[PDB]
Amino acid sequence: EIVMTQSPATLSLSPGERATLSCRASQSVSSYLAWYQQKPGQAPRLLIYDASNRATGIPARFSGSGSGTDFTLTISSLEPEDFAVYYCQQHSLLPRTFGGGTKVEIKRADAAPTVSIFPPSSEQLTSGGASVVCFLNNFYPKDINVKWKIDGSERQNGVLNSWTDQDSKDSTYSMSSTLTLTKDEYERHNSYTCEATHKTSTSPIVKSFNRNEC
Amino acid sequence: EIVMTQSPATLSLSPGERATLSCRASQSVSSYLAWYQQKPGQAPRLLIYDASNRATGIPARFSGSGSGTDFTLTISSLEPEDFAVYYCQQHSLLPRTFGGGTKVEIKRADAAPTVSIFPPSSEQLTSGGASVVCFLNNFYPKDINVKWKIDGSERQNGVLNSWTDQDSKDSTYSMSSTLTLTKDEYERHNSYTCEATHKTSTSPIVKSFNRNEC
Amino acid sequence: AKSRTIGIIGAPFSKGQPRGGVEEGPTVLRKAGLLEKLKEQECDVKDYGDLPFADIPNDSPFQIVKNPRSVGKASEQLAGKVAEVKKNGRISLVLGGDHSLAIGSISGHARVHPDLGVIWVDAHTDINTPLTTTSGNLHGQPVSFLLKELKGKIPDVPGFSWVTPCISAKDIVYIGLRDVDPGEHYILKTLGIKYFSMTEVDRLGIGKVMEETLSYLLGRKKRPIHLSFDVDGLDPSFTPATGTPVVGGLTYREGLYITEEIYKTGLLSGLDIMEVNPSLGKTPEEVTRTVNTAVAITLACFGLAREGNHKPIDYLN
Amino acid sequence: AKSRTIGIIGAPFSKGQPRGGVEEGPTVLRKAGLLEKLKEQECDVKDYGDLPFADIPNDSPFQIVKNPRSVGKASEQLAGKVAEVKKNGRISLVLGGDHSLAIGSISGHARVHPDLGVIWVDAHTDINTPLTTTSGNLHGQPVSFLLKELKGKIPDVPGFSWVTPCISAKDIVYIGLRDVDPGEHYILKTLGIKYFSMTEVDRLGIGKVMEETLSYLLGRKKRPIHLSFDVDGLDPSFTPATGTPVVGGLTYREGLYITEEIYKTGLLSGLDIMEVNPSLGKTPEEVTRTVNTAVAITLACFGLAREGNHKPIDYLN
Amino acid sequence: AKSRTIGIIGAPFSKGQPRGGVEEGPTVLRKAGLLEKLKEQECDVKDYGDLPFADIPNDSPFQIVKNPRSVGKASEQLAGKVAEVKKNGRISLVLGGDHSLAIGSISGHARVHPDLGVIWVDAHTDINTPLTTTSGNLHGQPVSFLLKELKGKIPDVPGFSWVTPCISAKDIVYIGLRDVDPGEHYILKTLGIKYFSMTEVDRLGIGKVMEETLSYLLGRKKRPIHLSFDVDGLDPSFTPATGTPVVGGLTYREGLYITEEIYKTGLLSGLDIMEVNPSLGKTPEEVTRTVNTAVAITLACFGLAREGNHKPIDYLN
Ligand SMILES: [Mn+2]
Ligand SMILES: [Mn+2]
Ligand SMILES: [Mn+2]
């Protein structure tokens, strides 16, 4: 099961210069592997066929090299349509393993998240649930951890974090701190807190509300 | 950073036959690595010096081989004093990485956990805390997940699981579901539940209590 | 004796064939104990080590032929080593690998005995040209480099400058062909090559086939015989762990038989065991059957006959 | 040409045999691409569609014979369709199904050529009578309706009014028999039918067997040959996905061989592929081996010879 | 011409030295483009590929000497390959690796020219014996196997049966010694070996040192010179990515100078670049300085002189 290791896990480079990527083998694949262009929810189309040589509908800038253990994927003329999770994939040993993921983001000026926290509705309370979700918005780069608290004492098993891709226009990111509780647990407490933490956030961004305040 | 991978992660073999273990390299270490005997809280003493040849105070049964990618640690005359977390360790590349862990347990007949659940004291309630812990006891093998519920709705961020080694005499295992709450959260609810789940447990072992029942 | 005097040449080379993994060819045949299974009967076994196969990094392709120069360098190296072990007076046991190596395996054998014969037991003829193949894989073009009747028509594909075609079209017998692409069969019919495919194998019976094969090669004159043997030429019920399995091959019985007729002439002078691939068995049991098959084939080549093998002393003592 | 000019007749019928599931006979053989695997060599392939098999709801049994009228209606319909495709000048590729259909498959073939021969390659003779069987299953009584030497002795079982026995007992050769119930072998010995069972197959060799079979049928006079071929006649190591598997059948090699001798007479004029059943393979791999076997059998009937097949242009160009 | 006619032998071997990682010796020197940086001036460059180093699994230790048989087999193989490339009339560029290989690198060079000289530019003498070392590491015992004045005193350590001591104690000059264990300096003083350590290097000046070195070797008679060159003999400010760095080595200027004096005799006949280790640079910049150093050393050996190199045509045109 030769493990193929992609040394750039993530990548964020502006429309511009070379975006040389790395993929390593645990054996000698020896010029027998390829490169792919998995756009989100699409066909992971071939970039480079046999460690080189640029297959059949490739634009201009997708040279690469190898032969035979640690290979290269050069994106010289970056062309911002190419922002996709890239994959090397060894071939000439069974079973035919893949790389890990080479998310090519957009490099831009680090955006700060706009963070606030939101209750369950009375329409929800007539159904009998509690879903207190904080909503994080327009930041760069991806990494935020959000903590919850039962009036000061932390929460899990409802808490879910889910991120989109990078935006087309302002090129930002995404998270809801999707948390679900019960109506009984809702009514026993007021001060519900959302503690964001981004690289732009020097202090951890806390936004809160009491129950029966809004 | 050549990663050394130990293919037997855990091991449970009776006092008896061969206990051949495996350690693989991401490159050619080429007969340049060793084998260790880390007893819990002790000195991880050398077993086998250079992929073979049995160093200087080794008893009788600790042959091994290699040269040069995927190596062997044979424990032929098992000798039940030898129940320790074992480590291969590559040497002749910098930096000098290690294996993962080769916990050599005792193989015995699968023991069922004795499971029940325990409240906070009034001496605790005069201090103002809540610590509802379930106590799991004398089982084999190690793996149990224990769920908690707020009268039927699950719990985390207090819940802690902690296991000992295997016992000397009956050779069993260990867990407390160490959970901590607040006195206020304690007084708002009664039916506190502990749901064990072991391989011997065909049904998930639920033990419960109401507050002000005991 | 004269026969069962063996020089083993392991040749872990792959770049003629696309399915990488045949370079664990000599490793698995040696760890199945081919050496020691020779050593019961009077086998003068001398291992000459494996050949180093250097990696040309810019082995740039031809029009269709791909990885040419690595194949040509490997077969030139093997031609020197086969000429070396035939100057040692032994029978060249050259096992790989793939049929790309059989270029130098027949070439260096012809460097000592220029008037040999080739029994190319294979599912395929492997006589595509660099121009009129559609693969360009050199595990199926060794025979086209070797026939003198094809000279002036083979391109100067790089790595093959040393290649002198050395055998005649009337001096080669295919046995067990079962899947031929059209270029190879036009060559087969125009040169007048004698061949016994699985049609003619079943027609005469495998024994009358080996009878007429020895009547074709040795019926004119006694001469050295070079059994170059593919392991996909047998049926994939016995060897599924090969590169190109085609159903309908020889039974394992008859493969052993063809080797035993070549032994009982006493004229075995060169042996090839190619296309063994442990990486393509779907179970290791498939690999185990395949490798035990190829080992016992090699045994019955050098006179591990199924009738018996002996040492000439009284055993009632 | 004259040969490899094919009319395909799929006939998904089951009620001669008890194990329901053989009605996915033509479906699996077509989805294995028998049509396109013919079309490489010069196969004039014309699919005539599947035959509709109506369901007689009150197909009331005979004494022992059960589902008689559906079998008789199916074989009468197939006799009309076989006579149609033989008036088209093609070679009738009639594949089902079960041997119950071979009544009309030999009958409509005799409606054009009354002096043909039948090579009934099967594990069984399938010549039980309606009176002296113990099954009453019409997947084993087609041959008893067809021999003129059995007339005045076959009952008027319903559905079989149209049945004229059309072939002579000296004009049929069984090849590969291996399990016969006693009534069929008394018929076999009293009529003086020539047959080569697996005894005689192993005795002469499969090639001398096909040699004497063609010497028996065609040695007197050139005449059309109707290979009606069961797929349990091969060994169940190759076709376990059949209705009645009996161990000890022909090797897959020899099955392909029998078809290739019938091709190289140039006198193939009718072909039956019966008893294919994808529902009885214990794994789908068993079904895959069985169907690829029967497909390549049908290929080697119409001249996908293992020696090679070509189109007559120069390929060095 | 006579000089700058190069046979490159890459030898990725490590088991003489303990710090594993020097087997990426020829890989990094080739990917730094030593071949193409030769090819500007008139360098007849012929790469002969890397040597295969088989792994003896039970390479059991001696008393102190450890991994002996792998070293002896590697140096015997290299002795054959050096004798091969010296029969090719080229200058043997043998780069590894470690000084264990210099046994066969001087041995096969003496197989063609038995009266050569050795300029062993190294921080250490590397002339420990198997008996009177305290390491037993064969990256520091090549010279003790090679001197005829040490015969009858070297043990029969396994792998070294082929070893004939081939050079005289008065036919070797150490240049740049700076850390010697006591056994090696008793050998150095008792044999009367001429040597210029960093004391004598600074005393005469590096130019008067190379003047007297060529006056010692070539002042008697013109004879082939075998510069065997360690890369720790330079100061670790320039090559910190070596196996045994000792501070106080030659400046990079003077290392290039020693190579250029060996060139301007026109008598360079064998070259060793050992102990290059990319795995021990604390930064890759350290590795980059080390490898560019060793590359330009090898350039100034074959006549990439710092004065200039030319092709003899007018360039005002
Ligand atoms: Mn083949
Ligand atoms: Mn049958
Ligand atoms: Mn040194």
From Swiss-Prot, chains C, D, E:
- Which InterPro entries would you find in this protein's record? Arginase (IPR014033), Ureohydrolase (IPR006035), Ureohydrolase_dom_sf (IPR023696), Ureohydrolase_Mn_BS (IPR020855)
> By which gene is this protein encoded?
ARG1
Which disorder is recorded? Argininemia: A rare autosomal recessive disorder of the urea cycle. Arginine is elevated in the blood and cerebrospinal fluid, and periodic hyperammonemia occurs. Clinical manifestations include developmental delay, seizures, intellectual disability, hypotonia, ataxia and progressive spastic quadriplegia.
Give the record's cofactor note, including how many are bound.
Answer: Binds 2 manganese ions per subunit.
Keywords for this entry?
A: Adaptive immunity, Arginine metabolism, Cytoplasm, Disease variant, Hydrolase, Immunity, Innate immunity, Manganese, Metal-binding, Phosphoprotein, Urea cycle
PROSITE patterns hit by this protein: ARGINASE_1, ARGINASE_2
This enzyme's EC code(s): 3.5.3.1
Metabolic or biological pathway:
Nitrogen metabolism; urea cycle; L-ornithine and urea from L-arginine: step 1/1
Q: Which GO terms describe its biological process?
A: adaptive immune response; arginine catabolic process; arginine catabolic process to ornithine; defense response to protozoan; innate immune response; negative regulation of activated T cell proliferation; negative regulation of T cell proliferation; negative regulation of T-helper 2 cell cytokine production
Q: What does this protein need as cofactor?
A: Mn(2+)
Give me the reactions it catalyses: L-arginine + H2O = urea + L-ornithine
Compartments it resides in: Cytoplasm; Cytoplasmic granule
Q: What is this protein called?
A: Arginase-1
What triggers expression?
Answer: By arginine or homoarginine.
Q: Per UniProt, what is one Pfam family of this protein?
A: Arginase
Naturally occurring in which organism (per UniProt)? Homo sapiens (Human)
Signal peptide stretch: none
